[PDB]
Structure 1
Amino acid sequence: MRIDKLSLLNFRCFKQLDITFDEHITILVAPNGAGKTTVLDAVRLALFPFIRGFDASLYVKDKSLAIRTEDLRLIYRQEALNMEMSSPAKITATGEWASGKTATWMLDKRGEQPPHEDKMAAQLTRWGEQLQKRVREEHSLQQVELPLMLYLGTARLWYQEQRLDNSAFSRLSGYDDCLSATSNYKQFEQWYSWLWLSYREHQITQLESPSAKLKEGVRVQRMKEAIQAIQQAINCLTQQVTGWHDLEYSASHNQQLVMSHPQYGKIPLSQLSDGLRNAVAMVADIAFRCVKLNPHLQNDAALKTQGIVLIDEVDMFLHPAWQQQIIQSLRSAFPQIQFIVTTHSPQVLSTVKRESIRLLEQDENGNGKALMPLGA
């Protein structure tokens, strides 16, 4: 979808806040205190209505996706013995789903009562259910494109039957743990290893019975093109600056992924630099979701998929020459996704214009301002 602005009232550290988001790229910088995680959590809480209408609900018991009592402001006064909650907590998300309509959905919590949603949240989850039911039917000539809602946190490296063909499954499995705060690298390695081995098996079998090629070769073709897509995205980060390219799988290396370099050969990914692993994990996380969601594009799963992706500390483990080429490379790899990223490195801030910078300042009473730089 898309988001235009977000308003916060009586949240964790903000008494009130109004923030505006850019069309393509926006960067949040806060010199002191928290506040970046607060805004990212607010945006993450404003999109759970969509994913809830996709069989993802309290079965996993992910209690972090609803406003909690610990998320309400609690003021301490030195001259009094009591400590009173400030009620109610309110998130007002303004967005745009399909070109033409502007929506404004609100999520509020009052004290210890269960959280409450407005009519627009119900409308949004009904839209999610509508897309699910439209996908699940196969007796249609016109296919549909799903949006991508992904959240990447600072815990994305802590603890580092597969299918691809069009169906109700393998098109809704890309929403599994999309907004979770844990790592999801094992899933990528399993899926990629399965895809590579099955592609090798299919290309071996192709030489046996060419008669059914009209029904078989296309399979291989699909299982080829997808790979290319993924690889292309990864290259856009790892080749011009570092030199590594063409992520591959080979059982000859004790069945683990490898990467290629012009001069240092083919080396396992498990014993490379930290920044390369970070970039590979991020771009892989975006890409394999993009290719599972829209197998029907088969070459523009990364160049036509639309959605919203959240990143915390995008410049983690990278050197300045790399930090001067991360934003443009992310834009080139995925040109149709809106990004909300949080940084603090002065190098990254010099690769973007003044319209994509938001300085968050907080007063003593909690009032917050999301300003833009004065000079240019």
Structure 2
Amino acid sequence: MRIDKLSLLNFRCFKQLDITFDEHITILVAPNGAGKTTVLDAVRLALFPFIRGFDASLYVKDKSLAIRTEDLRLIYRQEALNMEMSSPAKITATGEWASGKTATWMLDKRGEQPPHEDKMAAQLTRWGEQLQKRVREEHSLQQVELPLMLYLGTARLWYQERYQRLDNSAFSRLSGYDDCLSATSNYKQFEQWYSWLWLSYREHQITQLESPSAKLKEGVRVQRMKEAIQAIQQAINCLTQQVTGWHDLEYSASHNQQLVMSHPQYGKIPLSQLSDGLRNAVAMVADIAFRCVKLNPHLQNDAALKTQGIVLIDEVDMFLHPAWQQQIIQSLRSAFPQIQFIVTTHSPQVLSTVKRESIRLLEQDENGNGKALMPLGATYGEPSNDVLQSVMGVDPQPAVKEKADLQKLTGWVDQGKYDEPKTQQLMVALEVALGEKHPQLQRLQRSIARQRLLKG
């Protein structure tokens, strides 16, 4: 499944908006407001009709998975007492469901009336229902492959502490959609399933060792367990190993029944005792990895490398340091090379690692009209300050007390009047205030030398 375009109308922040998405990775950048969260929420709402067809619906009473009366646009006018709503609120999406199957579906809401959807939105539920039907007829030789939908919000690390099988069955396969678009943490689901997986692997290994007469039947159960573990560990390594050195997440009973990681020089330490960025990244990658493994068990090792779907991440570079920020996107693309990623960030280090066609800059005018444009200049491989000033419009020189004097000195020196006593006094004052090794002062000295050389 893929989404090519999205258009909003009278939604939370935008009177209207049109935004297209790259095929593999898209990054949303916004200096002011909450436009990025609004776009992510709209996309998440547009994907729910598909999940609704698998019995995964508001059975836990998830009211955020539909357009609410709080999602409509309210205009406050100072000179008038009353305040009205903008109706209807609409979400229109274009994309692809299966190979060669292009569609366009819409969701709308009028005032306090219940939300309504058109006929293509119903066909999107019919497709999920027929996929479920094909999954439940396991007495077949053909294989059906399910897509992935996932949402990762900023609250994915808030209350990690509050809260099994793996086979080719409908019940086991459809557990990969459980709370897939939820806004809360999903860490304990993973921890319990991974603990069961490791314990079953070890117990079946010893059972096979003590009586291998059941080879042709039970030695493939252990092989499946090993292949699942290998896929998950490889996916996590792709992100953690090169930067931090930690690798091979496991479950250890001798460490008080905890998940542990290994380091060449620090040994085995429980994950709960590692740094914030490491825990964040591990949770983020593990979510996708085991959902991929549970959805498509017939892809033993290549479950993550051959799975298709859409993943949404808000603040992808949370808690990561600048050296780690320069490698997160490529790590994600290498771990899951068939998934469409839509992320948000405000870090020049991340923006310097993608091409300008994968960046969208969001802005509004006074009346709520929105625009999602590309950067005017190249960003791929450029220095961080270039991206910071050219794209985000921030001067790399901080606004310290001496900035205005520096600008005045630059303007005076570059225009030929550098031998005047006033200019020299300002020069010496700024040298003592900022030091003689300041790059701007150094290039001003170079400019003075060049101008002196020319006059000859």
Pick the TM interval, shorter chain: over 0.9
* Cα distance between partner residues in 1 of 2:94 and 2:175: 28
Q: Secondary structure at the match of 2:172?
A: coil
Instruction: Show CA shifts across 1:68-124 (max 9, x none).
Output: 000000000010000000000000011111222221100000000000000001000
User: CA-to-partner distance for each residue in 1:294-330, whole Å, 9 max, x for gaps?
Assistant: 1100111100010000000000000000000000000
Q: Secondary structure at the match of 2:245?
A: coil
Which of 133-142 and 53-62 deviates more? 53-62
Conserved 8 A contact 2:208-2:214: no
Deviations 1:201-231 (A, max 9, x none): 0110111222220111111000001100000
How far the C-alpha of 1:375 sits from its partner, in A, is: 1.1
| Aligned equivalent of 1:210 | 212
Q: In terms of mean alpha carbon deviation, does 97-106 or 193-202 score higher? A: 97-106
Task: Name whichever of 230-239 and 49-58 sits farther off.
Answer: 49-58
Q: Does 1:244 align with 2:246?
A: yes
Q: Indicate the larger mover: 40-49 or 97-106.
A: 97-106
* Separation in structure 2 between the aligned mates of residue 193 and residue 263 of structure 1, nearest angstrom: 26
Runs (4+) of structure 1 exceeding 2 A deviation are none
Partners of 2:3 and 2:258 lie apart in 1 by 39
Q: Which has the larger radius of gyration?
A: 2
CA distance in 1, matches of 2:225, 2:102: 39
Q: Please state how far the C-alpha of 1:59 moved relative to its aligned partner.
A: 1.9
Q: What do residues 136-182 of structure 1 show as CA deviations (whole Å, max 9, x unaligned)?
A: 11110011110000000000000119000111111001100000000
Q: What secondary structure does 1:267 align onto?
A: strand
In 1, distance between residues paired with 2:135 and 2:324? 40
User: Given that residues 74 and 83 in structure 2 are in contact (C-alpha distance below 8 angstroms), is that contact kept between their aligned partners in structure 1?
Assistant: yes
- Counterpart for residue 363 of structure 1: 365
Q: Which has the higher helix share?
A: 2
Q: Which residue of 2 aligns with 1:37?
A: 37
Q: Which runs of 5+ in 1 are unaligned?
A: none
CA contact (8 A) 2:362 2:370 kept: yes
1:158 corresponds to: 158
CA separation in 2, counterparts of 1:361 and 1:41? 17
Aligned-partner SS, 1:276: helix
2:56 counterpart SS class: coil
Question: C-alpha distance in 1, partners of 2:271/2:100?
Answer: 45
Bigger Cα displacement from structure 2, 215-224 vs 159-168: 159-168
8 Å contact 2:258–2:270 — kept in the other structure?
Answer: yes
| Equivalent of 2:233 in 231, 240, 252 | 231
Q: TM-score, normalised by structure 2?
A: 0.82
Q: Which residue does the alignment assign to 1:16?
A: 16
- Shift, 1:58, TM fit: 2.7
Deviation at 1:364, TM superposition (A): 0.5
TM-score by length of 1: 0.99
Q: How many angstroms does 1:56 deviate by? A: 1.5
Identify which of 274, 277, 282 aligns with 2:276.
274
Distance 1:347 1:58 in 2: 39
Question: Match of 1:172, SS?
Answer: helix
Query: 2:182, 2:57 → 1: CA distance?
Result: 12
Output the aligned Cα RMSD: 1.2
- Segments of 5+ residues of structure 2 without an aligned counterpart are 379-456
Q: Percent identity among equivalent residues?
A: 100
Secondary structure class of the residue paired with 1:328: helix
Cα distance between partner residues in 1 of 2:169 and 2:34: 43
Comparing 156-165 with 338-347, greater Cα deviation is found at 156-165
**Distance in 1 (alpha carbons) for counterparts of 2:101 and 2:231:** 32
CA distance in 2, matches of 1:103, 1:369: 24
- Report the equivalent of 1:74: 74
Deviation, structure 1 residue 57: 2.1
SS of equivalent residue, structure 2 residue 168: coil
> Who is 2:123 aligned against?
123
Rounded to whole Å, the distance in 1 between the matches of 2:195 and 2:168 is 19
Helix, strand or coil for the counterpart of 2:360?
A: strand
Q: Name 1:297's counterpart in structure 2.
A: 299
Q: Number of residue pairs matched? A: 376
Provide the C-alpha distance between the structure 2 equivalents of 1:207 and 1:341, rounded to a whole number of angstroms: 47
